[model samples]
Target: SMSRITIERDGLTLVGDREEPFGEIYDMAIIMHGFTANRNTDLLRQIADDLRDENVASVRFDFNGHGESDGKFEDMTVCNEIADGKAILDYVHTDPHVRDIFLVGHSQGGVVASMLAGLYPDVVKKVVLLAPAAQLKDDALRGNTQGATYDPNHIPDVVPLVGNKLGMKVGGFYLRTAQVLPIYEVSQRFTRPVSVIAGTNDQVVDPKYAKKYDEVYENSELHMIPNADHRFSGGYKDMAADLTAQFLKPAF
Candidate 1:
């Protein structure tokens, strides 16, 4: 069974779809989408359904500004997304039916999840990071973000995303904060099983980030999907979701 759920973060309403498996429930996973994407992304949607098939309930939600959530795209930032993630985690933690918690994040969402799990290792039982955009900080430091170039030392009030199909505009605060984000330093604190998946052919976020995650985590499994892009398009999304579900499924 699936139901629409709403979570509140700093007065903003975050929307999500909660999927419950048949019979009793103890474990639940929260699925997060990346920059400019929502819970309906093909890969994320597949993972949600696949998790349900594994008898694990899942919640896939939009970040502050994407999809049905409340907020403006230009006002969004990594810190803001982290808060959004924590709100969901808090919501999941309070559920009386839940005993274990898992987090699944893609791209920028992956970055958020890694840090969250690290910050709350006792709360997050396991984590799955797909195409984690650890390189985002590096990209910001180099003044290159999604094909948009700017002066990293002096970011303007707003950075115009040039050449992007969406023509997105982000506040300079996003880049300024990303330049100082301690992505790896903070993520290495989580000492639990982690699954890191990345596409070998992904051009958006370097695949090396996935390998770096495997190196940092105390116990992590890395999967490099062959011929898969950042989004795992071209029929590879199913493979990605299947691998995720297999890793997250409880052992009998």
Candidate 2:
């Protein structure tokens, strides 16, 4: 069963769906959407549905500036995202029924999860990175255009007085400015088990990025799906979900 709920963090209302079995409380997994993506994204919903079969509860939400959450896009930062993730973990940890806790992040969310794992080593047991940007800063500095065509340097320094008309606020500026350096630092410091999954034909995030993440974490493993793209469309989502489910089953 799934239900809608709002979590208040730092005076912002983050909207999310809490899904679980009817009879028992099980493990918890927090899913973080990509940059510019919302809670209702198809990939997120697919992963949540698959996790339900294993009796794993999941909560996926929007950041302060994205989706139904409050805040301007420019006002949001990677640090803010990390803080929000921590708030979610804090909420989950309060539940006596939540036995194991896992974190799954897509794209920029993956960077947030990596930082959170390094920050709260005891709380987050396992992490899964879906097409994560491993060396975002370096890629920006070197002008590596392998992934998405987005230019991190072109983002405005301040929230434009003209609000985004697409209902998408400008978030991730802080991460773009100086906050992303810390994410790289956190990636290197992370010692926990992390699984990095990428598509062979991913246009948004190159498969090499996943390899970079694997190189950073000694315990990390990288999985590549042949002919899979950024969204993992055309049944790739199911394959990736199955791989993730099997990888986590032993730990659970």
Candidate 3:
């Protein structure tokens, strides 16, 4: 069964679900959703189910602006998301039922997870990233015009729309807080085991980003899924689950 819960942090309310296993205390995994996507998005529940079968507990939550969480989409930033993730991890760590902690993030969430692993090494035992936004800022600046392209050349100078409807206001600040947070830069600090999964057909995030992550992190593994897109629709989930389960088995 899943129970609804709220995590209060950085003056924001992050809504999430806590899946309690039937038996003894086991490890915990937290799934952070992708940009413009909610907690109930594809593969989240599926992965959670797989983890539950392995006697693992998991939590999937919305960021400050998405889903049940309380915040405007325009107000969302990478730093705030990372802060929210930390709050959830802290909450899970307090539970006696949680013996160990793991983090799994999709797309941009994966970048955030990497940052968290580096920042809070004690809590995050392992990190899993699915098609992470390897070079979002670089891609954005170079006008790569890649998959799921969105023009950041709109009005207001600061506020940039992440998508057509997903309006992310950059505000008047020189640093959008999200950009300056340096989520990707922090990946170099991760000393624990990290697993990065990328899709060959992923247009939004380049596979080179995963390569860069692997190159920088001393202890990291990269897995490329053949013919898989960003969504991982065609049997990609099973592959991801298998890879994640394998990564956790030894650590757990």
Candidate order by decreasing lDDT: 1, 3, 2
Q: For model 2, how does the per-residue alpha-carbon lDDT over 1-252 read when each residue is reduced to its tens digit? A: 237878889889988888885555688888898766787787888778778877788899898788888887768777788899988888889887788888888888888888888888776778888888655556655533233234456654442223234433343355365424666567666677888889999876667778878887878888998888988787998887776666555344
* Model 1 misplaced stretches (Cα beyond 4 Å): none
lDDT tens digits by residue: candidate 3, 1-252: 237888899777889987767877789899988877888776787778778877788899999878889987666667778889889988999988889899998887887888888888866888888888756666554433233343444323354544564444444221334334565567777778889888898877879888888888888999998988888785887888778767776344
Q: Per-residue lDDT of 66-105 in model 1, one digit per residue for the tens?
A: 8899998888999999899999999999988776899999
Model 2 TM-score?
A: 0.85
lDDT of 3 at 169: 48
Give the number of the best model, judged by TM-score. Answer: 1
Q: lDDT: which candidate is best?
A: 1
